[PDB]
A paper describes a structure:
Cathepsin B shows endopeptidase and exopeptidase activity, an uncommon dual functionality among the cathepsins. A special structural feature, the occluding loop, covers the primed binding region in the closed conformation of the enzyme and confers a dipeptidyl carboxypeptidase activity to cathepsin B. The two protonated histidine residues (His110 and His111) of the occluding loop interact with the C‐terminal carboxylate of exopeptidase substrates, and of epoxide‐ or nitrile‐based inhibitors. In this study, we developed peptidomimetics with an inversely oriented warhead that undergoes deprotonation by the active‐site thiolate as the key step for the covalent inactivation of the cysteine protease cathepsin B. Cathepsin B has been validated as an effective cancer and inflammatory biomarker and a promising drug target.
With Pro in P2′ position, Leu in P1′ was slightly more advantageous than Cha (8 versus 12), but Phe in P2′ gave a better combination with Cha than with Leu in P1′ (7 versus 4). The most suitable dipeptide sequences were disclosed as Cha‐Phe, Chg‐Phe, and Cha‐Pip (7, 6, and 13). Two representatives were subjected to crystallization and the crystal structures of human cathepsin B in complex with the type A carbamate 7 and the optimized inhibitor 31 were determined at a resolution of 1.45 Å and 1.70 Å, respectively. Hence, the different N‐terminal substructures influenced the non‐covalent binding event, but not the accommodation of the covalently attached dipeptide portion. The latter is held in place through a network of hydrogen bonds and hydrophobic interactions mainly with the side chains of Val176, Leu181, Met196, His199, Trp221, and His110, His111, which compose the S1′ and S2′ subsites, respectively. The N‐terminal CO‐NH segment is hydrogen bonded to all three residues involved in catalysis, including Cys29 and Gln23 (in S1) and His199 (in S1′). The imidazole nitrogens of His110 and His111 interact with the properly positioned carboxylate, similarly as in case of CA‐030. Our inhibitors with inversely oriented warheads behave as suicide substrates, undergo cleavage and effectuate the fixation of their dipeptide portion in the primed binding region of the protease.
Residue numbers in the entry: 0 to 254
The structure:
C-alpha cells in the first residue's frame, strides 16, 4: 500500500545529503550529479545513518571516461551507476568545501536565474582524473572508494518507480527540458510552451499531489536560488517529458 505522498527527507531524517542541493557549475555534468546525489543518499539509508558522506561528483565526472560519455559535454546515468559498481566513488563535497577526498573543482554559478555569482557559461573542459585525495584527507583515494553492489534500470512504470524510492531510496532520472522549465519557481511543472532544449538528469526523491495534480519531488543541480530552493515538482503518471522513462538506481555495498 503506497502512501499518497512520500518525501525521502522525511523518511530518513538523519541523512542530510537527501536535503542537499549541489551546483554543477559551468559544466554539463548533471548526469554525474544525479548519480552521486542518489548514491550518497542510498549509502546513508543502507547503513541507518552510520555512514553519511557526500559522494564525489568530481571522481565520477573525471574518472569514468568514455564509458560514461564526454564529461562536461554530457553523459548518461546508466553508465554512471555501472562505474560505481566497477571502480567505486570516493567522497567529495562542494566547491572549496575541503569536504572529503575530491571536492568539486568547478565554481558555482547562476543557472537561468539572477543572483550574486557569475552567470553559468558553456564550453568548460572536463577536469583531469586525479586518483589522489586533497592534502591531509584520510584515508587514501583507494581506501575512500564506495562501491555499488549493482546498477539497474527501473521500468517505465509510476508504481515501480514509487516502490523503488519507498524501499531503497532516491533514484536518478532524466527528462526533456523545454524552455518554460528554465523559469520554474513553484507548483507542479507541466510543459505549456517553448522549444526542446535537451535532455537533463536529476534526482527523484519522492512524490505527492498538489491541487489535485500528482507530482514527483525532484532535486536539480543548479544551486538553491534556482527553482523552489533548488527543488521542483513535475507531473507524475503520464511519462511527462520522459520523466518515468530513464530511471536508474543501484544498491550500495557495505563498506
Ligand atoms: C546537465 O548537465 N544538463 C545540462 C544541459 C541541460 C539541457 C537542457 C537545457 C537545460 C540544461 C545543464 O544542466 N547545464 C547547466 C550548466 C551549463 C550552463 C551553461 C552552459 C553549459 C552548461 C545549465 O545551467 O544549463
Amino acid at each position: 500500500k503506497l502512501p499518497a505522498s512520500f518525501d525521502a527527507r522525511e523518511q530518513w531524517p538523519q541523512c542530510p545529503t537527501i536535503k542537499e542541493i549541489r551546483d554543477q557549475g559551468s559544466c554539463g555534468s548533471c548526469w554525474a550529479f544525479g548519480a552521486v546525489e542518489a548514491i550518497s543518499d542510498r549509502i546513508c539509508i543502507h547503513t541507518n545513518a552510520h555512514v553519511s558522506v557526500e559522494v564525489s561528483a568530481e571522481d565520477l565526472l573525471t574518472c569514468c571516461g568514455s564509458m560514461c560519455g564526454d564529461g562536461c559535454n554530457g553523459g548518461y546515468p546508466a553508465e554512471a551507476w555501472n562505474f560505481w559498481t566497477r571502480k567505486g566513488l570516493v567522497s567529495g563535497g562542494l566547491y572549496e568545501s575541503h569536504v572529503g577526498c575530491r571536492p568539486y573543482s568547478i565554481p558555482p554559478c547562476e543557472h537561468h536565474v539572477n543572483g550574486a555569482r557569475p552567470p553559468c557559461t558553456g564550453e568548460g573542459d572536463t577536469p583531469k582524473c586525479s586518483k589522489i585525495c586533497e592534502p591531509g584527507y584520510s584515508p587514501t583515494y583507494k581506501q575512500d572508494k564506495h562501491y555499488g553492489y549493482n546498477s539497474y534500470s527501473v521500468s517505465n512504470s509510476e508504481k515501480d518507480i514509487m516502490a523503488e524510492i519507498y524501499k531503497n531510496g532516491p533514484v536518478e532520472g532524466a527528462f526533456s527540458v523545454y524552455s518554460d522549465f528554465l523559469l520554474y519557481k513553484s507548483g507542479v511543472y507541466q510543459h505549456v510552451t517553448g522549444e526542446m532544449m535537451g535532455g537533463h538528469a536529476i534526482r527523484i526523491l519522492g512524490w505527492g499531489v498538489e491541487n489535485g495534480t500528482p507530482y514527483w519531488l525532484v532535486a536539480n543541480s543548479w544551486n538553491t536560488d534556482w527553482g523552489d530552493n533548488g527543488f521542483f515538482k513535475i507531473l507524475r503518471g503520464q511519462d511527462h517529458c520522459g520523466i518515468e522513462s530513464e530511471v536508474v538506481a543501484g544498491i550500495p555495498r557495505t563498506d
